[PDB]
């Protein structure tokens, strides 16, 4: 009846400290479509994050890409925080560099 | 191009 | 090769929070090219790919008109299905629809599609003959009778065999430099020790388009389907996609494992191994 989001956190290009890149949080497989997604830099919500237009897969579950430009360093931690009706508490998924 | 608006369900 | 055009409609009620929202997006293959959102300050069909921008104002006005009409019709449809299932006025519900056409390399219609869902469950679908319906339950049988009286299947067959194929061919030509360009994956294999006994071999595919790809691990030439972890293919944000496949191997046995990559952009399929 409801389906909980899968979450991947990753960069557009291979991550190089000091080089500009895009940080992605891809949420998929969820239903219904309302969902809260923030990108975090050392725990703080990043502003001006954009996202794709709502679409869905052959099995009717929804997917969305949230993204922003960023420049990775070795100190800065990045993560994605997702809330959905299927989740008791928001789920935080860390960016594991080159997972 | 979209299909024309169809009948309500 | 072959190509598809698909439109995806999502209509969502939200009692106490205004009237139901209606969103529509259009794709050619894995490229989104239009959007509509009834929550926008001024809702309009809007471009989302450069090759659609050349369409004239009559195109944009007509697609906007259809979508504004659909916003109202889906609000009626949500009210109707709430009744068909004896549901309270307090819950939020969703109708989804996906429709479109597939064409072969010669541009000829391979098949048409039109399927609708209610709260994520199959509700009614146009059969492959483009002439009859499959209704999931006795509620959907009501919709089927309405649609038979309105000759809906006949109108969709006309669209699917005519306009859908003709516009898809036009889009493929106008966007040929991207829509008809397959970008092969960049590939590599990584090695992640788990313990003294085992390590993870991960076969990566990056930067490819379209999203269709086959990534497989073999051990001594035998597929390791049950033992391979395949991540869901994911968008990079620049039109391309990413994917990886992972297998846990005994330490010292890494050379028995090969990763095999098939993709339309590749001159020939790839066989890769870990290169320490
Ligand atoms: Na929640």
C-chain residues near B3 (CB < 8 A): 7, 66, 99, 156, 159, 163-164
89-108 in chain C: CB under 8 A from chain A: 92, 94, 96, 98
Residue C112 vs residues A4, A92, C95, C147: alpha-carbon distances, Å: 31, 41, 20, 17
Instruction: Compute the nearest-CA separation of A35 from chain C (Å).
Output: 13
All residues at 6 or more sequence positions from A34 whose CB lies less than 8 Å from its CB, including other chains: A84, A85, C12
In the block, tokens 């993709």 appear at C263
Strands A36-41 and A44-45: antiparallel
C-chain residues near B7 (CB < 8 A): 73, 146-147, 150, 152
| Most distant pair of Cα atoms in chain B: their distance | 22
Instruction: Compute the nearest-CA separation of A14 from chain C (Å).
Output: 9
- Please, how many CA atoms are within 13 Å of residue A73, restricted to the half-sphere of its CB? 5
Closest CA to A54 of C114, C10, C92: C10
C-chain residues near A22 (CB < 8 A): 237
Helices (H) and strands (E) in chain C, counts: 5, 17
Q: Give CA–CA dist C48/C35, Å, rounded.
A: 7
| 3-class secondary-structure state, position C7 | strand
Whether residue B8 and residue C95 make contact (CB cut-off 8 A), yes or no, is: no
Instruction: Compute the nearest-CA separation of A42 from chain C (Å).
Output: 23
Examine residue C6 and say whether the peptide bond preceding it is cis (omega within 30 degrees of 0): no
Residues recorded for chain B = 9
Measured in Å, residue A89 CA sits from the centre of ligand 1 at 6
| 3-class secondary-structure state, position C193 | strand
Closest CA to C47 of C208, C212, C236, C174: C174
Cβ atoms of residues C23 and C45 within 8 Å: no
Q: Give CA–CA dist C186/C240, Å, rounded.
A: 11
Nearest to A24 among C10, C27, C237 (CB): C237
Q: Give CA–CA dist A20/A12, Å, rounded.
A: 10
Q: Give CA–CA dist A19/A8, Å, rounded.
A: 21
Measured in Å, residue C127 CA sits from the centre of ligand 1 at 38
Cβ atoms of residues C133 and C114 within 8 Å: no
């Amino acid at each position: 009846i409801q389906r909980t989001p899968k979450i991947q956190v990753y960069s557009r290009h291979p991550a190089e400290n000091g080089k500009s890149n895009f940080l992605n949080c891809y949420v998929s497989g969820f239903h219904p479509s309302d969902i809260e997604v923030d990108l975090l830099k050392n725990g703080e919500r990043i502003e001006k994050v954009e996202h794709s237009d709502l679409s869905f897969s052959k099995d009717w579950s929804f997917y969305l890409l949230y993204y922003t430009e960023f420049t990775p360093t070795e100190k800065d931690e990045y993560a994605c925080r997702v809330n959905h009706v299927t989740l008791s508490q928001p789920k935080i998924v860390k960016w594991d560099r080159d997972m | 191009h979209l299909a024309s608006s169809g009948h309500s369900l | 090769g072959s190509h598809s055009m698909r439109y995806f409609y999502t209509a969502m009620s939200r009692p106490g929070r205004g009237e139901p929202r209606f969103i529509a997006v259009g794709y050619v293959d894995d490229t989104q090219f239009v959007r509509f959102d009834s929550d926008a300050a001024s809702p309009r069909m809007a471009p989302r790919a450069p090759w659609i921008e050349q369409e004239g104002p009559e195109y944009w006005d007509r697609n906007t008109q259809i979508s504004k009409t659909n916003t109202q019709t889906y609000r009626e449809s949500l009210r109707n299905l709430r009744g068909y299932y004896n549901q309270s006025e307090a819950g939020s519900h969703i109708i989804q629809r996906m429709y479109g056409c597939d064409v072969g390399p010669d541009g000829r219609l391979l098949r048409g599609y039109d399927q609708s869902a209610y709260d994520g469950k199959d509700y009614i679908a146009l059969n492959e003959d483009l002439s009859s319906w499959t209704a999931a339950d006795t509620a959907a049988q009501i919709t089927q009778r309405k649609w038979e009286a309105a000759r809906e299947a006949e109108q969709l067959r006309a669209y699917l065999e005519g306009l859908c194929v003709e516009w898809l061919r036009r889009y493929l030509e106008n966007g040929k430099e991207t829509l008809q360009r397959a970008d092969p994956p960049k590939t590599h294999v990584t090695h992640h020790p788990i313990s003294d006994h085992e390590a993870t071999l991960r076969c990566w595919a990056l930067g490819f388009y379209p999203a269709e790809i086959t990534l497989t691990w073999q051990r001594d030439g035998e597929d390791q389907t049950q033992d391979t972890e395949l991540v869901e293919t994911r968008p990079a944000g620049d039109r391309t996609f990413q994917k990886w496949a992972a297998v846990v191997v005994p330490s010292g046995e890494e050379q028995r494992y090969t990763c095999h990559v098939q993709h339309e952009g590749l001159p020939k399929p790839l066989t890769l191994r870990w290169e320490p």
